[PDB]
Symmetry: T
Subunit: 64 residues, 12 copies
């Protein structure tokens, strides 16, 4: 059985790096992370000093 | 990093109140709740005494 | 077996009340109405005296 | 010919009131507003004093 | 309030059995499981000995 | 001209059998049933003795 | 309250004419037909003498 | 950079002609119109003398 | 077994004719073409002498 | 690099078996078939002796 | 009230840079730009000297 | 007439580079490649030494 957690990563650099940021967090807290699916991308502009790229991913991990 | 939990709130009054019901529950159990996105709305009719409005939300919270 | 009818309710008050308007009509004409799923919401503005909220629902009822 | 503008209204009260807020703004600035279609709903929580309901609408107006 | 967890069940037999596999896991770990919604189906072919059917479900459970 | 009716079939056995259950009901009541399109699948768990598979289909029939 | 019926019209000429074919049938059988929304278009090729254009519409009519 | 405007054209003749009607209006008011994407089609029936075909398009134009 | 090829037909006349253009090409190169499903429509404007209607279809053909 | 082919399998038995039918055909003609994604399911009723279940899959295979 | 404009940015380098290109243009012409949502990505190949990455964004700005 | 092939490119570097990988393969094997549309993005994690970014594109090419 796989389970997914819905995470939004952030980066001041790129959408790829924002995806990595979410996956990094999943790997800190979960064993057996196997894949991630991008489900949204966006940019925060008017509440941050530098534009912040966001990539939302479903991060799948194998249970057991 | 943000994480989302998928909650369905209920209310005998309105769709807004049902959304609030889900957010209230998230705030009971989670720190740093920042926003909610409505993803579905419906009404339970034929298993309840009064119509029950349901609003499903992804509730986002900031990790750390 | 359940069947669904696709109804758009209207209200001069709210989206919840417009959903109720559709369900009320289903209950006038059908037995065993069990749930409704919201599939669209909108507002009629430029052909009515007061803004009219519309909520489109699939209204499910149990056959037999 | 109709044209649509994509507006997000806000309210501290309800999703209906947030939709009205967007339509009110369109009517301040545009003639011949005829209808609005709801395309998204959400709630701002962690940057405001009170929860703020948001309703995004395509607001249609007739040209000429 | 209901909460959903996003699980992918697997089976070497059928899509129904894969859905059951996810629900079985939810019921091992959660009280008050009430329904599941199928959101995806697929087949793993080129990393397994026998084709493996997968069914992804949102599994809803009632909180409290 | 074809018309579609939106039916949810049920089965304690499988998603295929649930689809058949809806089509069977359509064929009891309608002439010239020609095809069905699956539009949703789910499982009722926490209001039934045995898990109940549901398959929602648009069932098309030819008019005249 | 509005209700919608899901009809597929056919024509050997065009997608517009196929939409008209469905609306014509609705108007034969229903009062107060007010609008139609196109939801699908296709072409039957390998079971007919001439290509047959199909347009599926939700046809809305006002109740009462 | 391209920008899109969301226009609904109308015609008493066809969906193609309704798309053209929107593009014609864009070309009256904008330079460098480059393409249009159809996003919806429908028919107004019960507020007009003759059925009116509508085609909604995103009309793209190049900035500068 | 059916297979689909994803083709975009073009016409200076209409969306129907653009769909036909894609199907014509499929029939030049493939046996047992049975149906086509429209998946997109658009108009090329700013790289052609006359507006060019495009209709994208999945064209299904029976294998063997 | 992976490539996908869009195949509709058929079976007189089940949706799973129809998916298998498409994958079987891909494996007859292609090396390195790795996975399949279900994209549609339906039932042919009024042109066959027995109901025919159809499952449409994107079948992925690794190039080289 | 927020308003969105639908812009396609371009870059010979990356999808992130193409998103930035659209946001840069919005910021040249608009006050109070607050966020952008990615809605499409693509690559122009056969009308340019170098591949051109395109990212379409809804760019939101606060009115007043 | 345009045709599309559905390819998933891979890269250990970025989503843009993964899109390029698919387009490169199309250009090795096909004449008149004109554009690509991104349809999915994901990351392989738990079967590779380094995270592998994947970008799925429909790659369009002009026939003849
Ligand atoms: C980065 C980002 C910020 C946002 N802020 C937002 N802020 C807000 O008040 N309402 C919104 O709907 C909203 N959407 C956002 C979407 C994205 C992708
Ligand atoms: C409130 C609600 C109840 C429902 N009950 C349901 N009960 C059921 O047996 N099958 C369903 O698919 C189903 N759907 C529902 C959807 C909603 C929104
Ligand atoms: C309330 C409402 C009215 C509308 N009127 C409409 N009137 C019209 O001529 N064309 C349309 O597409 C249209 N859409 C509508 C949508 C809504 C939600
Ligand atoms: C109200 C609202 C705020 C939001 N803020 C947001 N803030 C953010 O940093 N990223 C987001 O994606 C985002 N989405 C939002 C969506 C909504 C509906
Ligand atoms: C079973 C399955 C395996 C998959 N493997 C996969 N492997 C991969 O490298 N990339 C993918 O996008 C991918 N998708 C898959 C989807 C399904 C449904
Ligand atoms: C079987 C089934 C039951 C359900 N019950 C439900 N019951 C409920 O109170 N709210 C829901 O949204 C809901 N959804 C359902 C969906 C499915 C598919
Ligand atoms: C016209 C048309 C015929 C079709 N026939 C079909 N015949 C079939 O056996 N399976 C299908 O999925 C199918 N789809 C069709 C779709 C369209 C639009
Ligand atoms: C032409 C058209 C008219 C419409 N009128 C409409 N009128 C209305 O009162 N409510 C609606 O939702 C609505 N939708 C429409 C859609 C279309 C496509
Ligand atoms: C006809 C047509 C041309 C287009 N050109 C295009 N040209 C371009 O540079 N970027 C695009 O996204 C794009 N989209 C198009 C869509 C359509 C339907
Ligand atoms: C099995 C099947 C047959 C079909 N036949 C069909 N036949 C037809 O004339 N028009 C259609 O749209 C159509 N759709 C179909 C869909 C399915 C899934
Ligand atoms: C970059 C790009 C170019 C395009 N050109 C295009 N050109 C065209 O003639 N028809 C199209 O549909 C089309 N689509 C496009 C999409 C994209 C994303
Ligand atoms: C990279 C990738 C791998 C995957 N592997 C997968 N592996 C699997 O067993 N089941 C899946 O559904 C699946 N999906 C995937 C999706 C992506 C995008
Ligand atoms: Cl828009
Ligand atoms: Cl989710
Ligand atoms: Cl329907
Ligand atoms: Cl495809
Ligand atoms: Mg930096
Ligand atoms: Mg988002
Ligand atoms: Mg009360
Ligand atoms: Mg729901
Ligand atoms: Mg009042
Ligand atoms: Mg609607
Ligand atoms: Mg207040
Ligand atoms: Mg939104
Ligand atoms: Mg076995
Ligand atoms: Mg999946
Ligand atoms: Mg049994
Ligand atoms: Mg359902
Ligand atoms: Mg003729
Ligand atoms: Mg169809
Ligand atoms: Mg005329
Ligand atoms: Mg519309
Ligand atoms: Mg001509
Ligand atoms: Mg397209
Ligand atoms: Mg048999
Ligand atoms: Mg299909
Ligand atoms: Mg360069
Ligand atoms: Mg696009
Ligand atoms: Mg490297
Ligand atoms: Mg994918
Ligand atoms: Na989730
Ligand atoms: Na817009
Ligand atoms: Na219906
Ligand atoms: Na394809």
């Amino acid at each position: 059985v796989f389970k997914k957690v819905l995470l939004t990563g952030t980066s001041e650099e790129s959408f790829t790096a924002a995806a990595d940021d979410a996956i990094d967090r999943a790997e800190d807290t979960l064993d057996n992370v196997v894949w991630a699916e991008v489900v949204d991308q966006g940019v925060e502009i008017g509440a941050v000093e530098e534009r912040t790229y966001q990539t939302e991913v479903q991060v799948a991990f194998e249970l057991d």
